[PDB]
Structure 1
């Protein structure tokens, strides 16, 4: 009953498909016990990268404040629209509300979405898009919600506004998003001014915190043991056992556990990557790219031309030094970081020195 060393990550079991295109995360990043109102996460779309030629954050370096080449995902963040701020409190059973406080006017892309009109799946009943529901009487009793003592974290059901980013569809992408803030009272009080229609981007993301890069990754294949775990080939490479593996079980006992080196789905969950440090926030048009060299390929920010398989960016973006899962077209969900490691390098803006602009190709 031996062991051979840990080639590949064990605990992505089961390797379940992330059906919904936007990433979810049950364990949300807990409160900013500093900022009086925030959100927990936000929204993005994966677009492309640039080489930010700047200078180091770590100030005591041997080559301190030199020229530094760096990755950056420049993800488009249009602000999300509220349907209603749901006032989750407690009861003596559990995490149960009392009322929501609706928004009056929603967006336009609420037409096609609020349903589950898809084949081999359940509906919803005729809870369609909004008429004019509970907000008038509901807005005052969320004050009385904290007076219960039985009171929990108040949240807000949101939807996107799409075309603004170059993707042309008008059926919105849904999610609930938790409201953070100072205390339970404050994430209710200041969130009354949030449900009006649209929220702020800058409430959750302060410039130069960190931002944990969760999104939905690509489904690579039905990947075998070589790529999915990390086995080799045998150098004889004949017969049956080329890209196979050896042991799955063991003689004594016959019954093993969930470590075994088999084939199946790779990637494609709502997989969480850790503290990618936020570079800058730029609202409109600032940085460019497009340089005629081989580096890595096919995602170009305002060159001569545009991006391939996305569209040219004329919106409002947030720049994360690092990355975030998906590929082109894929809609992402940027969660914030609860444990912010390094000291916040805010107040002033971070350096942009110069950047190229030409073709990307020949």
Structure 2
């Protein structure tokens, strides 16, 4: 007979296989569609997650209740040292999908990248690209220019190979991360010319993104272990006097379908899934050589973005950084992937220009009360330590 009262199902079937992700680094499954009438440009970058903080600004939204008043919002900080371009790839269209036919590298590669191709680097002979490099010194590199001409003639999608400089962060890891970044722009000949001219050169994040732009963040979520149904799916707890456990589901299916079905909630692994969160607005792109990259027009204090005592379980942000409104998936120290938007925005909430007024820099290791070390000393006075 029918269920006595109505209620929606617990959870969504769209994120259905609740398994661990295949790869630790996030994966870009689609790129924005190309327009040949625009100048050549990149479409993605990568960085590392530092933490969160608080800001204050005044809203601009006619008709709203908080119009022309101050608001408090939470933000996220991403540490983004520049990337180095190493090579490019070409793709062609087939009745079975896209496939790659060539890839051409640069002459010199750093030890950061070469560690990626090894699992015991400390005792190897480190010969990863030794024979490939000699192709540049033979016949004026005719074999290198032959492959470039092939891409100009047959390929219709061009992507670049780039890696992070992980030695500029406080992380203990020495092995860099590598990915492919598509080039959207004018012509296939233009894409190859632009891509090759960037060989073994650094690229800064301010040349890719800008302020007041909506972007997407791709990463793997925080991991929990083996988890029961109550927390994994959100089912009602059973009464207090239930024998043999009360954190379960009471009925896992009717009689005659005669199998446990795929739509019932059961205990298993939770967390560490691949996710793609969209529509995050960029508030600030700060430079690493600026000594006042956390100061505004109405707040003239000379200070940087790092809180007093440093970010917890992370070091200090000594490089360029991007400030994003809200939250993103992933724990601290984890590699983030930033991608341009696939959507069109006309909402008057995504077209707003943001001007900041104050940025919190107090300690997050406790109930911090001062913004700078000088201010704390001025308030307290003189201590026995100062002699």
- TM-score, normalised to structure 1, is 0.81
Question: Distance in 2 between the 1:347 and 1:195 partners?
Answer: 36
Does structure 2 retain, via aligned residues, the 8 Å contact 1:9–1:229? no
User: Which SS does the other structure have where 1:70 is aligned?
Assistant: strand
Partner residue, 2:151: 145
1:307-318 to 2 correspondences below 5 Å: 307-318=311-322
Q: Which stretches in structure 2 are left out of the alignment for 5+ residues?
A: 296-303, 368-387
Mean Cα deviation higher: 210-219 or 20-29: 20-29
Of Structure 1 and Structure 2, the greater strand share is in 2
Question: Distance in 1 between the 2:36 and 2:73 partners?
Answer: 31
Of Structure 1 and Structure 2, the greater helix share is in 2
- Cα offset, 1:88, TM superposition: 2.1
Instruction: Choose the corresponding residue for 1:178, options 170, 177, 182.
Output: 182
1:111-260 to 2 correspondences below 5 Å: 111-117=114-120, 128-129=128-129, 131-132=132-133, 136-137=141-142, 138-139=144-145, 142=148, 145-148=151-154, 151-182=155-186, 184-255=188-259, 257-260=261-264
Partner residue, 1:297: none
1:257-272 to 2 correspondences below 5 Å: 257-272=261-276
User: Which SS does the other structure have where 1:23 is aligned?
Assistant: coil
Mean Cα deviation higher: 91-100 or 314-323: 91-100
Question: Distance in 1 between the 2:46 and 2:178 partners?
Answer: 11
Change in CA separation of 1:357 and 1:201 when aligned onto 2, cut-off 3 Å: closer
1:44-123 to 2 correspondences below 5 Å: 44-56=47-59, 58-90=61-93, 94-117=97-120
Q: Which stretches in structure 1 are left out of the alignment for 5+ residues?
A: 119-125, 289-299
Does structure 1 retain, via aligned residues, the 8 Å contact 2:345–2:351? no
CA displacement, residues 202-253 of structure 1 (integer Å, 9 cap, x when unaligned): 3432322211122111112212111111102123353124110133333232
Find out whether 1:332 has 2:328 as its counterpart.
no
Partner residue, 2:360: 356
Change in CA separation of 1:59 and 1:348 when aligned onto 2, cut-off 3 Å: closer
Change in CA separation of 1:111 and 1:27 when aligned onto 2, cut-off 3 Å: closer
User: Which SS does the other structure have where 1:109 is aligned?
Assistant: helix
Partner residue, 1:287: 294
Question: Distance in 1 between the 2:149 and 2:92 partners?
Answer: 12
Instruction: Choose the corresponding residue for 1:39, options 29, 38, 42.
Output: 42
Partner residue, 1:294: none
- Cα offset, 1:197, TM superposition: 2.7
Mean Cα deviation higher: 313-322 or 262-271: 262-271
- Cα offset, 1:39, TM superposition: 2.5
- Cα offset, 1:6, TM superposition: 2.3
Change in CA separation of 1:101 and 1:206 when aligned onto 2, cut-off 3 Å: farther
Does structure 2 retain, via aligned residues, the 8 Å contact 1:207–1:346? no
Does structure 1 retain, via aligned residues, the 8 Å contact 2:217–2:338? yes
Question: Distance in 1 between the 2:199 and 2:90 partners?
Answer: 12
Number of residue pairs aligned between Structure 1 and Structure 2: 342
Does structure 1 retain, via aligned residues, the 8 Å contact 2:90–2:151? yes
User: Which SS does the other structure have where 1:277 is aligned?
Assistant: strand
CA displacement, residues 240-295 of structure 1 (integer Å, 9 cap, x when unaligned): 2411013333323224653221111222122111211121211125228xxxxxxx
Partner residue, 1:296: none
